[PDB]
Design a protein around this nucleic acid. Sequence first.
RNA 1: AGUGUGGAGAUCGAAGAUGAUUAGAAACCAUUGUAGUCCACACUGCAAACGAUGACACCCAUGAAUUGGGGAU
RNA 2: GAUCUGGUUGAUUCUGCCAGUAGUCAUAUGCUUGUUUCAAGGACUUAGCCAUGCAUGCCUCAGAAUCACUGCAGCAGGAAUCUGCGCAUGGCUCAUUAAAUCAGACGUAAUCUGCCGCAAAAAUCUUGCGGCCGCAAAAUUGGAUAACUUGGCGAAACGCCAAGCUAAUACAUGAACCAACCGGGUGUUCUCCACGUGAGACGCCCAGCGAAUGAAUGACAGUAAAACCAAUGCCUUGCAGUAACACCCAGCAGUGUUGACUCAAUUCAUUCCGUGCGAAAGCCGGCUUGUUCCGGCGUCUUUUGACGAACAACUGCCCUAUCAGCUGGUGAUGGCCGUGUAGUGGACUGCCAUGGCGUUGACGGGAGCGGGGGAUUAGGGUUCGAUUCCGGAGAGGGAGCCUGAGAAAUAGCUACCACUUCUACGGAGGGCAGCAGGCGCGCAAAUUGCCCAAUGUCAAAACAAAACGAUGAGGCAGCGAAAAGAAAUAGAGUUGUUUGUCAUUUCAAUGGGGGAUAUUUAAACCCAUCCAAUAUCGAGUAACAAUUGGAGGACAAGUCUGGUGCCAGCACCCGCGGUAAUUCCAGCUCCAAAAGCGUAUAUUAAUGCUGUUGCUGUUAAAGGGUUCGUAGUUGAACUGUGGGCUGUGCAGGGCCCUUGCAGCCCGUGAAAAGAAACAAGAAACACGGGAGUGGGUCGCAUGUCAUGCAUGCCAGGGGGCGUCCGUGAUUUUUACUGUGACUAAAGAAGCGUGACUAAAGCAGUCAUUUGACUUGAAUUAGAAAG
RNA 3: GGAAGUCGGCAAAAUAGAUGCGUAAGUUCGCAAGAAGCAUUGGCUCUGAGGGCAAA
Lengths: 198, 260, 183, 71
Amino acid sequence: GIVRSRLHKRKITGGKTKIHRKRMKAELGRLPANTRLGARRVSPVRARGGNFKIRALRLDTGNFAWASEAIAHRVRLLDVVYNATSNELVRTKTLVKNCIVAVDAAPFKRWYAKHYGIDLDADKDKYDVNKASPKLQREWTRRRRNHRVEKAIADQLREGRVLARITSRPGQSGRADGILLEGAELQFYLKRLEKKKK
Amino acid sequence: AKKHLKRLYAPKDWMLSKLTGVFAPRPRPGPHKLRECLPLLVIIRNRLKYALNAREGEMILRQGLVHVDNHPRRDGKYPAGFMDVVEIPKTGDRFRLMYDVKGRFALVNLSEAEAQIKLMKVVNLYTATGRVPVAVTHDGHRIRYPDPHTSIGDTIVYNVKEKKCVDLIKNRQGKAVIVTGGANRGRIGEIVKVECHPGAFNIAHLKDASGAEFATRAANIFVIGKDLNNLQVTVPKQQGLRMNVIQEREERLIAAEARK
Amino acid sequence: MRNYNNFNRVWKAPRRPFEKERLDREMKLCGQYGLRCKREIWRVNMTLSKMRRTARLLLTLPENHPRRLLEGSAIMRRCHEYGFLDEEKDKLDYVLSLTVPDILERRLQTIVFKAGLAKSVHHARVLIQQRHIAVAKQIVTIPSFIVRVSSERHIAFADASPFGNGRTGRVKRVRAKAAKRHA
Amino acid sequence: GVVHSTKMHRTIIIRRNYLHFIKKYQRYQKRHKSLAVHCSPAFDPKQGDEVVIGQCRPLSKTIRYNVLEVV
RNA sequence: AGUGUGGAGAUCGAAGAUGAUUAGAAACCAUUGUAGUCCACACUGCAAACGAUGACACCCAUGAAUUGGGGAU
RNA sequence: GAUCUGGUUGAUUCUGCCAGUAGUCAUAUGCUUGUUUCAAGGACUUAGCCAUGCAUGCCUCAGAAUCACUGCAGCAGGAAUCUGCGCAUGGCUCAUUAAAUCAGACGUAAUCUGCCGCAAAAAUCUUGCGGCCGCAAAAUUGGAUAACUUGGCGAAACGCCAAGCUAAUACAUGAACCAACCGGGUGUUCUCCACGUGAGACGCCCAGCGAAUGAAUGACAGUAAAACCAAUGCCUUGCAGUAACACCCAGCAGUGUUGACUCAAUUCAUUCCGUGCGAAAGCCGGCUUGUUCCGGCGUCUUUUGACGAACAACUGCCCUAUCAGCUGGUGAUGGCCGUGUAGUGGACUGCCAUGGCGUUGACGGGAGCGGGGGAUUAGGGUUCGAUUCCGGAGAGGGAGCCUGAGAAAUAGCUACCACUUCUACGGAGGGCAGCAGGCGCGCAAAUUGCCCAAUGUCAAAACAAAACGAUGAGGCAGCGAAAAGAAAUAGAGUUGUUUGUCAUUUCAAUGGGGGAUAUUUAAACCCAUCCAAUAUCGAGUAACAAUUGGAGGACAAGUCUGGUGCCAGCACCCGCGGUAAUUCCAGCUCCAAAAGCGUAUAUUAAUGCUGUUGCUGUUAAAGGGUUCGUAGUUGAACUGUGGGCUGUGCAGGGCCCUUGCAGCCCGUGAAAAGAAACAAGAAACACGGGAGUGGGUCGCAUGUCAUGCAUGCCAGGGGGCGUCCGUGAUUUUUACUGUGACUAAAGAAGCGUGACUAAAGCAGUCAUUUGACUUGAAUUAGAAAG
RNA sequence: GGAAGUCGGCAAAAUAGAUGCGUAAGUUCGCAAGAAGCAUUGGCUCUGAGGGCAAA
Ligand SMILES: [K+]
Ligand SMILES: [K+]
Ligand SMILES: [K+]
Ligand SMILES: [K+]
Ligand SMILES: [K+]
Ligand SMILES: [K+]
Ligand SMILES: [K+]
Ligand SMILES: [K+]
Ligand SMILES: [K+]
Ligand SMILES: [K+]
Ligand SMILES: [Mg+2]
Ligand SMILES: [Mg+2]
Ligand SMILES: [Mg+2]
Ligand SMILES: [Mg+2]
Ligand SMILES: [Mg+2]
Ligand SMILES: [Mg+2]
Ligand SMILES: [Mg+2]
Ligand SMILES: [Mg+2]
Ligand SMILES: [Mg+2]
Ligand SMILES: [Mg+2]
Ligand SMILES: [Mg+2]
Ligand SMILES: [Mg+2]
Ligand SMILES: [Mg+2]
Ligand SMILES: [Mg+2]
Ligand SMILES: [Mg+2]
Ligand SMILES: [Mg+2]
Ligand SMILES: [Mg+2]
Ligand SMILES: [Mg+2]
Ligand SMILES: [Mg+2]
Ligand SMILES: [Mg+2]
Ligand SMILES: [Mg+2]
Ligand code: NA
Ligand code: NA
Ligand code: NA
Ligand code: NA
Ligand code: NA
Ligand code: NA
């Protein structure tokens, strides 16, 4: 079937390799997952050695990490907004590694409020920051005195959806984990998204 | 996955005649490598002569009458390589597998409190789950908590009966070593220097009792004592001293003449 | 198929098939030593050629060479025990001077004839091939048996032969059986 | 080796020039072996420069070496 | 020698013609004669293109010459 | 053994081929063959085609018997059938194949890995009783489904329904407490203390292995003193002194590994949905016979190391230019983000950018499986390698695949295309480049044998006992003048006819062979042993009778005798035959090799006729018409006499010079130190987590809530070292040569060894003994690259 | 069915636009050549690429 050998490739001299053996199972390839945005659906694949690769055909939620806060939360995937390979992978809503998506910022807002006692939504089921005991209030000031948040991230949390980058391979792991875009990476991709709308 | 081993492809140290058969007992995976092991069938049939053939060797072995490292082995394809203590309690054999100056395997007879002791060369060190320091030796043992001073290349003295380490000999200059592989296999000398080549094979230069300098790759040396006199294990008859070939020939001729 | 028993050749034919001098010398040797064919002479020639080639290779090397020392000692020993070379001469250059008669003297047939167990060299071959000669209490039936100097003393008639401690041969056995038939 | 071509992006071609001994004629003959080497942006080698290369895993269909130092 | 395009065309002269000689004799020999031969420009690159002897370097006996450049009387 | 000879002339000296000559485990073919030993043996042609049979199965004390099996009287064997494991090995063939394969040398820190070695494992609310609760606890888990039975279908089919049983170590499920340590998040929770970086309980939410994503570790090692403030430890009521740490642990890791790691491991955040994780809810023994008896097994998950797999490539590897350009739409060379994979990668998608290769021969074509190795050779070489060991590839041809640790498997599957076989015409099959054996094809290659006795492999398996696992792998025999070794076909005389010959005449001996008390052998068969041990057959034309080529030369050996007459023939070549043939067809004789000897065709030597060693080019073959000229090859010198001393040499012409000895800042300068010369293998720093507790150079302090059961107990300095880090040379390699490492056997050398010798083999040997030899199994060489 | 019709393919049929690939003998080297051949093409909804002008 599909192979990953160099027999079919032309030599650097331009010559044609004369193949003198049949194809092997140790050099096979397999059809891509083409993971889409939808309700979760996966298929196991028996890889070499007896192990299993979870070929994910659709995924909707995943583990997205706030790296500067060293935390992670399981959120819903709302959209895929940018792909470096092509924009057809954005039209078809294909989830691949290093693709830019928009996720649900409510868990991150709630964790920020619970950890630092700062409510982003207030200044513009939900946690109450005035209910906290005054031992926790002393805890909040100790945490708050070292840490400052970025306005670009804070604006996205208030809006309800925050951009993120997929850091897992869905066609191999079967899951769509990621990281929130921060710093110069966020400003790089935001500029690309503004070019499309104009 | 190969199951067979031709007699021509078998190691020469097994001393299997090319006309006796086409095949040789292929060593099963285990403690020692296929090229650096002596199968239990070979030991019990071609060395001890207890079994006249493979059938009788199997009858001996499958009863658990042969103990290797204080554990009965029923397999005639068991590797049973260097430093291994093989004991037959019914005949009280109790010999250790070593190398002689010619490089061939030798059965050095032991006693009590010596058949309980086995030397192991640490070939790897790694931290296992739970932050447990584990040392892997030349025979496949994984020591769960070795000496804190253990390093790759040093040897440990293992009590096979109690399954515990009793001493550690570091691989330093001046230590007594036996050569385990190569052209100088079986020779015993003291480390005089170890040329270290990062990324490549280190070269240990050794000098034996007679003062003959010889070198070998550092992976072929095995520390056996703190000095060339204070060895921690008994060695074969020649004491790891290579003899000049001409002198050996004349001595053998003189002995043969004196016999008659 | 899958047999590893080794075998080689021991003789080689001469380059020129018809030389008068070579044919005359070979007929001299054949008549003198009672040989069935020229192939025995050619076998002796091949052994001599191998010995002389080894001696030349050793003599090329320096004296202090360990290979020269060991192999020259071995070839000296072999020549001295097999009687090809006199014990007085012990240099490596005396092997090069060996000749075909030197080895042809050491054959069991020639040794028997010289020792007197046979009246002729053609009588000796028959005596050996007929299981009558025993070297060191072992019956030897091969005429080309090269005799060592230490084994020269022990050559005698076999204990199982009629010319010894054995029973009478066919001529007498058959005559006795015929006499029993008549009686 | 010596740098032979610098026309690719982050990749150079080096030449290893050696003499091969032909036994029958007891004489040598000059031969060369071109190699595709990945050059990190930490180095700026020119054609004819002398470089040291270390073997690494396949980075492309021809690259198996990485430049370690420019002499 | 041959080719192309212009010139030139004295002489000699493949082809051709005629006269001889011969058994025959558009062979040798006579008398002619075209192309050529001469030139300009463009081709060709086929010689017993030979010293039948590749190039560069070193050493190398004798007597009489010869060409060119020096130096001395 | 480093060897030549015959043919060009009237003769001569050359060049030069032709012909001779020796080998070939090198094939065929002819003629011939007594004995024994050791052997190859349908590669060549047709990777042509194949009738038939047989080649891979496996059970112990230890997974599952109600055979309606058997014996015995429950017990023990047990058909079958589930279950587990193997069948990816071995065998075969060499078709493919030149950045391929393969060899030596390296990688995989780019990966997978059942069996096997040594390890590790504290996740899990289960069960039974009464009314979610209560109470208790050697967890007494649940559905199937074969074999079987019943009824069957089908011409058949290593074809099939349907219904009734019934198990597993099959499948599913599921175990609280016992039972630890350790962390993270919290409560508008209480108790204190101060008026919050307070402290302490208590609650409840999580804290297992493996996996995913994200942060943090995974050390340091190129500077000294005071202040002040806040907090915090102490001292006492200001900093000596002071591992760290707000009890219950006063040392329960401040310290993984490598040349290198984004690695090992640890902690924190969130996740894992079958696509993980039993104490098999397993089995068998002992005893002593145990709600804690003690073994032997078996199994899940995790882990690393053995056995492997896969991938990459440092050097090498035939002929051809009447093959010079090759690659790149639609991957060519690279880059970027992905995807795929067990992994790395233009392996692949998208997007970029123009690369990559070649006269040091690319590309194309032709012949080839690649090694170890074989033949032949003074040396250099030349040739061969289908074939035993190793590596690759394939199973009529292609392709695809499933299962599995591992297959792109073929005595697996699927489909096409060739061929095929059966049929009751509806259907159903096939794959000898396994073994034996056919049929073709050719110049060319054996038995449809016996056996697992050995050598191995698989397995559920020692052997034995009702009770013998398979195996065409392998061994054994048959066939077998491929090849190799040893060896017969007579020996001693008498007499006559120096010897010798011949005719006699003896005399013993021994085989071939015929047998055996037997021996061998799995059994046979060979061999060996013997022909009485009381008791064992046999040569005289020793008919038990040697052949194949020759006698002009090369080339050993007839002017012999008949035939024949440029005919028949012969003759490698030169030649012979036209009537007194040294050559033909015969007889006799002689020659050469010999159980062998011819012939054909290759290949090596001969052949310095391929010339690197080592060819030739005025006239024998062969300097280009001449110049320029890139590759390519080749290329002038020069950094450079070390001195002194003492002895000592047919030394020689105080001097020079031999050999040895001891000196030399060993040119000049400058004086241990400095200076000068050197010294990157140096120097200058600085690291206890640097040296097996920081290298040379019994009581008494600590402190004592400490297995503090510990620590110091020379002081100081100065040096000199080990390691490890940093920083510095306006930094030296390579070929050659000398050593050393690394590096399968078989084969080739070689040491030893009376297998009766030998080709062999790695054996054996020696006392006579319940055993020695602490038996031996030496050593080499083997391109190139590293 | 396919020139068998007919003096004879007369007449008819046939072919075809654009784009990509590909293309022989011969040759005055210009050609032959649209040689011969293969493939693609619609409608929709998208996505790229190819510019001006002003502004320190
Ligand atoms: K056979
Ligand atoms: K004229
Ligand atoms: K099964
Ligand atoms: K990549
Ligand atoms: K057919
Ligand atoms: K067959
Ligand atoms: K010549
Ligand atoms: K040039
Ligand atoms: K018509
Ligand atoms: K045309
Ligand atoms: Mg789309
Ligand atoms: Mg006319
Ligand atoms: Mg011309
Ligand atoms: Mg002539
Ligand atoms: Mg195989
Ligand atoms: Mg490869
Ligand atoms: Mg072939
Ligand atoms: Mg295959
Ligand atoms: Mg076939
Ligand atoms: Mg297949
Ligand atoms: Mg088959
Ligand atoms: Mg098939
Ligand atoms: Mg006969
Ligand atoms: Mg001939
Ligand atoms: Mg000439
Ligand atoms: Mg050998
Ligand atoms: Mg038609
Ligand atoms: Mg008509
Ligand atoms: Mg018509
Ligand atoms: Mg018309
Ligand atoms: Mg053309
Ligand atoms: Na996009
Ligand atoms: Na005339
Ligand atoms: Na006339
Ligand atoms: Na010839
Ligand atoms: Na093979
Ligand atoms: Na067209």
